RNA sequence: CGCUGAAAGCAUCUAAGCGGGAAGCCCGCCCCAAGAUGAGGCCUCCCACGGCAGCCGGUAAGGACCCGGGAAGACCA
RNA sequence: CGAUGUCGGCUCGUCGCAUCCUGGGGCUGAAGAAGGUCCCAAGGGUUGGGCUGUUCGCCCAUUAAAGCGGCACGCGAGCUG
């Protein structure tokens, strides 16, 4: 899990979702998992 | 391009009665209640159940698709039923039934004994393959998930509890 | 939740399996029940126990009527055991057998006005290197203008002891029903002759 | 000490 | 002429059903009853408002995410003694305090305001013991 | 970290709903505690005293004073 | 400025969390063991000694760890000097 202020897609498989008032990037590549914060 | 307006086929004889904020589905294998938003309308027709939304605002469109699937899953639940399979992999790893219970040997210093919830039935064919069976689809998936969590797939070796049809994606070590 | 009133008699050590076990000896029973607290009447469950016979020439009429309704001889101490309802109308040491574990409640010994070093194990001051009349003194008691006051609960001098103390999970080493004796391993609050309460332990 | 003569407040006894 | 001041009146007793009413909007009216400002002879320096009995205080209603997020707070005076109780748990332990706290903050501070708080009688559950006073049921 | 699941035919722990999950949070343990003036509860005792929500008196159940003391204690308690 | 005693030490704490340890985690160029990095977490813990007035720092021997800051560079009607 990366935690940063700029959450972006990293690859074309990355998906930007919104869980419980937060922005996540979930993806099949575990490195690409992001949470905004 | 839409799920809420898709008519729900109903086998015979599974009966579906509508009630305020709940539909009741009775079938050969059991019965299930489906809590429904009062904002939707559930309509029963000749061997076909249908759902309508009152507007095209997002909460109604979001509830619409959800409500149809929840009802379709209950209808399939009482006639076909639901089940999921688990594949045990690993050298010493195996499973066996004990009474109605599921006992797991997956590399710990002790066995792991899973008890089936009310409405769930465990079966072990091959000692390396488990099937979770029940009429509630979420409940079947919950139990199946619970079992798998006891020893998840390894990242480096084809060891652990696996879903049927779960790919084996491993990464190198040294 | 079994319990019984008692008096601390004193300490010794016995020998058990080539080991010396320090014991304090408690004279527990017999404890007549004089009132029962019911959920219908009182809102909870407890037994009022009596202990030690009293000269009726010392017991006033309000008390004497309390004993009368119980059909019990006048007794010197009344204490309740909470959530205890014995089958009989008399509680004795035989509610405990050796090996069980108990909690014992007593009134600790009273140190009166205790300095900060006896009451709270403060470090005092130095005894040389210029130390000026502060050898047993507590030091600072605060900050400065912020917050310009002293915390509630500040550890300071004052009365210490003569207070209720429960020490927990004591092994019952023996019971001598013939004499209402109760041996317990370790130490128990208070002086010899003090009143103590012996209860089944709450540890597991 | 304040006292002696480098400082001058809070700190020593009578002399004035 | 001088402004009319009433001789001591006989207080009215009043019953309110709190079920399903919004916490703050109910408290506003109970405060008004307590102060007696619904009376045409309202005098600011005596107690002449009604006695107000409230039932079903456990079924008061609130909007937004306040069950989780409204935090009641108590300070003991000791280091680190600020306690925090969310609405949820206050409702699940002492549900009558939710209304009481809301009405209390809408009453005047001082001796009279404290007495007026004593004329409030809040109950969880549908019943109350003041049958003797025969409270007139109010709609709010 | 999930289950089920739309909006968005797929996918999504979430928008409806349901799990798991910290030495931390709430209880549980130990101690204080009804001046908690919101002054609580239970058991028992005395009782309709004599004189023009009040007054003065003689008592009841009880209590205090005094005394002998106390692993209680500065005095007080 | 008709006085708001000035470093450090000692004593006594208490708070913050940007967390040193302990508890829970995701990612790892994570085989295991042991690390790295980030997230949650302030309940409790956070040693003894040589040098120097020292704060700090270096060093010795240990440790789960030997955290960083605020409280008038916390605290002289509490001591030291
Ligand atoms: Mg995906
Ligand atoms: Mg002796
Ligand atoms: Mg023996
Ligand atoms: Mg020994
Ligand atoms: Mg006695
Ligand atoms: Mg004692
Ligand atoms: Mg006692
Ligand atoms: Mg004592
Ligand atoms: Mg002692
Ligand atoms: Mg001292
Ligand atoms: Mg000491
Ligand atoms: Mg001592
Ligand atoms: Mg001590
Ligand atoms: Mg102490
Ligand atoms: Mg010392
Ligand atoms: Mg020292
Ligand atoms: Mg010393
Ligand atoms: Mg000395
Ligand atoms: Mg000197
Ligand atoms: Mg001095
Ligand atoms: Mg000296
Ligand atoms: Mg001092
Ligand atoms: Mg000052
Ligand atoms: Mg100062
Ligand atoms: Mg202040
Ligand atoms: Mg005392
Ligand atoms: Mg104690
Ligand atoms: Mg032990
Ligand atoms: Mg004897
Ligand atoms: Mg001078
Ligand atoms: Mg007029
Ligand atoms: Mg209202
Ligand atoms: Mg009104
Ligand atoms: Mg009023
Ligand atoms: Mg008024
Ligand atoms: Mg809410
Ligand atoms: Mg004002
Ligand atoms: Mg998934
Ligand atoms: Mg899914
Ligand atoms: Mg939800
Ligand atoms: Mg949950
Ligand atoms: Mg789970
Ligand atoms: Mg622990
Ligand atoms: Mg917390
Ligand atoms: Mg008590
Ligand atoms: Mg009282
Ligand atoms: Mg009490
Ligand atoms: Mg009193
Ligand atoms: Mg109050
Ligand atoms: Mg009052
Ligand atoms: Mg009152
Ligand atoms: Mg009263
Ligand atoms: Mg009372
Ligand atoms: Mg009570
Ligand atoms: Mg008399
Ligand atoms: Mg004496
Ligand atoms: Mg005395
Ligand atoms: Mg004396
Ligand atoms: Mg100046
Ligand atoms: Mg001056
Ligand atoms: Mg001045
Ligand atoms: Mg001056
Ligand atoms: Mg001055
Ligand atoms: Mg943090
Ligand atoms: Mg924080
Ligand atoms: Mg950082
Ligand atoms: Mg850690
Ligand atoms: Mg860890
Ligand atoms: Mg890590
Ligand atoms: Mg690589
Ligand atoms: Mg390696
Ligand atoms: Mg490892
Ligand atoms: Mg992270
Ligand atoms: Mg901490
Ligand atoms: Mg803290
Ligand atoms: Mg700390
Ligand atoms: Mg050191
Ligand atoms: Mg030397
Ligand atoms: Mg040194
Ligand atoms: Mg140094
Ligand atoms: Mg400095
Ligand atoms: Mg240096
Ligand atoms: Mg150097
Ligand atoms: Mg370590
Ligand atoms: Mg280390
Ligand atoms: Mg600091
Ligand atoms: Mg500052
Ligand atoms: Mg500090
Ligand atoms: Mg500075
Ligand atoms: Mg400076
Ligand atoms: Mg300073
Ligand atoms: Mg400091
Ligand atoms: Mg000085
Ligand atoms: Mg100084
Ligand atoms: Mg200073
Ligand atoms: Mg000062
Ligand atoms: Mg000063
Ligand atoms: Mg000063
Ligand atoms: Mg000097
Ligand atoms: Mg000198
Ligand atoms: Mg000098
Ligand atoms: Zn990606």
Curated annotation (Swiss-Prot), chain A:
Pfam families reported for this sequence: Ribosomal_L36
Keywords: Metal-binding, Ribonucleoprotein, Ribosomal protein, Zinc
Entry keyword Transferase: no
Keyword Metal-binding: yes
Biological process per Gene Ontology, one example term: translation
Cofactor note (record): Binds 1 zinc ion per subunit.
GO MF annotations in UniProt: metal ion binding; structural constituent of ribosome
UniProt-recorded name of the protein: Large ribosomal subunit protein bL36
Organism: Thermus thermophilus (strain ATCC 27634 / DSM 579 / HB8)
Curated annotation (Swiss-Prot), chain B:
InterPro entries named in the record: Ribosomal_uL6-like, Ribosomal_uL6-like_a/b-dom_sf, Ribosomal_uL6_a/b-dom, Ribosomal_uL6_bac-type
Keywords, sorted A to Z: Ribonucleoprotein, Ribosomal protein, RNA-binding, rRNA-binding
GO terms, biological process: cytoplasmic translation
Keyword rRNA-binding: yes
UniProt GO molecular function: rRNA binding; structural constituent of ribosome
Transmembrane regions: none
Highest taxon, organism lineage: Bacteria
The keyword Ribonucleoprotein is assigned to this record: yes
Function: This protein binds to the 23S rRNA, and is important in its secondary structure. It is located near the subunit interface in the base of the L7/L12 stalk, and near the tRNA binding site of the peptidyltransferase center.
Family: Belongs to the universal ribosomal protein uL6 family.
Subunit composition and interactions: Part of the 50S ribosomal subunit.
HAMAP family membership: Ribosomal_uL6_B
UniProt name for this protein: Large ribosomal subunit protein uL6
Organism of derivation: Thermus thermophilus (strain ATCC 27634 / DSM 579 / HB8)
Gene name in the database record: rplF
From Swiss-Prot, chain C:
SUPFAM superfamilies: Translation proteins
Coiled coil ranges: none
Gene3D superfamilies: 3.30.160.810, Translation factors
Reported modifications of this chain: The mass differences between the observed and calculated masses are suggested to be due to methylation, which is known to occur in the E.coli and R.palustris orthologs.
Positions of transmembrane segments: none
Keywords: Methylation, Ribonucleoprotein, Ribosomal protein, RNA-binding, rRNA-binding
Superkingdom classification of source: Bacteria
Molecular functions (GO terms): rRNA binding; structural constituent of ribosome
Pfam family, one: Ribosomal_L3
Cellular component annotations (GO), alphabetically ordered: cytosolic large ribosomal subunit
GO biological process, one term: translation
Family: Belongs to the universal ribosomal protein uL3 family.
Subunit annotation: Part of the 50S ribosomal subunit. Forms a cluster with proteins L14 and L19.
Job description of the protein: One of the primary rRNA binding proteins, it binds directly near the 3'-end of the 23S rRNA, where it nucleates assembly of the 50S subunit.
NCBIfam families for the chain: L3_bact
Protein name: Large ribosomal subunit protein uL3
Top-level taxonomy: Bacteria, Thermotogati, Deinococcota, Deinococci, Thermales
Curated annotation (Swiss-Prot), chain E:
Highest taxon of source: Bacteria
UniProt keyword Nucleus present: no
The entry's keywords: Ribonucleoprotein, Ribosomal protein
One MF annotation (Gene Ontology) recorded for this entry: mRNA binding
Cited PANTHER family: LARGE RIBOSOMAL SUBUNIT PROTEIN UL13M (PTHR11545:SF2), RIBOSOMAL PROTEIN L13 (PTHR11545)
Functional summary from the UniProt entry: This protein is one of the early assembly proteins of the 50S ribosomal subunit, although it is not seen to bind rRNA by itself. It is important during the early stages of 50S assembly.
The protein's name: Large ribosomal subunit protein uL13
Gene this chain is encoded by: rplM
């Amino acid at each position: 899990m990366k935690v940063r202020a700029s959450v972006k897609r990293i690859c074309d498989k990355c998906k930007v979702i919104r869980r419980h008032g937060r922005v996540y990037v979930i993806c099949e590549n575990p490195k690409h998992k992001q949470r905004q914060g | 391009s839409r799920i809420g307006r898709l008519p729900i086929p109903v086998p015979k004889g599974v009966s579906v009665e509508v009630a305020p904020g709940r539909v009741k589905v009775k079938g050969p294998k059991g019965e299930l209640e489906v809590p429904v938003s009062p904002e939707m309308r559930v309509v029963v027709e000749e061997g076909v159940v249908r759902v309508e939304r009152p507007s095209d605002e997002r909460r109604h469109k979001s509830l619409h698709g959800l409500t149809r699937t929840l009802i379709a899953n209950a209808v399939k639940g009482v006639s076909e039923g639901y089940s999921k399979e688990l594949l045990i992999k690993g050298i010493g790893y195996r499973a066996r039934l004990v009474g109605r219970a599921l006992e797991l040997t997956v590399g710990f210093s002790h066995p792991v004994v899973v008890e089936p919830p009310e409405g769930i039935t465990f079966e072990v064919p091959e000692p390396t393959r488990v099937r979770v069976s029940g009429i509630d689809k979420q409940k079947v998936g919950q139990v199946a998930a619970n079992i798998r969590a006891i020893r998840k797939p390894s990242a480096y070796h084809e060891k652990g509890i696996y879903y049927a049809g779960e790919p084996v994606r491993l990464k190198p070590g040294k | 939740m079994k319990g019984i009133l008692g008096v601390k008699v004193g300490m010794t050590r016995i020998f058990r399996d080539d080991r010396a076990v320090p014991v304090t000896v408690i004279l527990a029973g017999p404890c007549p029940v004089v009132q029962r607290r019911t959920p219908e009447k009182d809102g909870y469950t407890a037994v009022q126990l009596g202990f030690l016979p009293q000269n009726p020439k010392r017991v006033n009429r309000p008390l004497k009527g309390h004993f009368a309704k119980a059909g019990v001889e006048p007794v010197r101490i009344l204490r309740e055991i909470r959530d205890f309802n014995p089958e009989g109308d008399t509680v004795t040491v035989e509610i405990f057998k050796p090996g069980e574990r108990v909690d014992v409640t007593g009134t600790s010994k009273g140190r009166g006005f205790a300095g900060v070093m006896k009451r709270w194990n403060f470090a005092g001051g130095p005894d040389s290197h210029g130390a000026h009349k502060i050898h047993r003194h507590p030091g600072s008691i605060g900050n400065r203008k912020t917050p310009g006051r002293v915390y509630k609960g500040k550890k300071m001098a004052g009365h210490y002891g003569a207070e209720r103390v429960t020490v927990m999970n004591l092994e019952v080493v023996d019971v001598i029903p013939e004499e209402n004796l109760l041996l317990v391993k370790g130490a128990v609050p208070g002086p010899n002759g003090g009143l103590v309460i012996v209860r089944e332990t709450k540890k597991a | 000490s304040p006292g002696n003569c480098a400082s001058c407040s809070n700190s020593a006894s009578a002399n004035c | 002429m001088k402004t009319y001041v009433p001789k001591q009146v006989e207080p009215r007793w009043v019953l309110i059903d709190a079920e399903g009413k919004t916490l703050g909007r109910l408290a506003t009216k109970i405060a008004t009853l307590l102060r007696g400002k619904h009376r045409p002879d309202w005098t600011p320096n005596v107690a002449m408002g009604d006695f107000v009995v409230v039932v079903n205080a456990d079924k008061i209603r609130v909007t937004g995410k306040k069950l989780e997020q409204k935090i009641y707070t108590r300070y003991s005076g000791y280091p680190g003694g600020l306690k925090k109780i969310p609405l949820e748990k206050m409702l699940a332990t002492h549900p009558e305090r939710v209304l009481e706290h809301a009405v209390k903050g809408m009453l005047p501070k001082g001796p009279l305001g404290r007495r007026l708080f004593k004329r409030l009688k809040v109950y969880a559950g549908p019943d109350h013991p003041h049958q003797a006073q025969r409270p007139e049921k109010l709609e709010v």
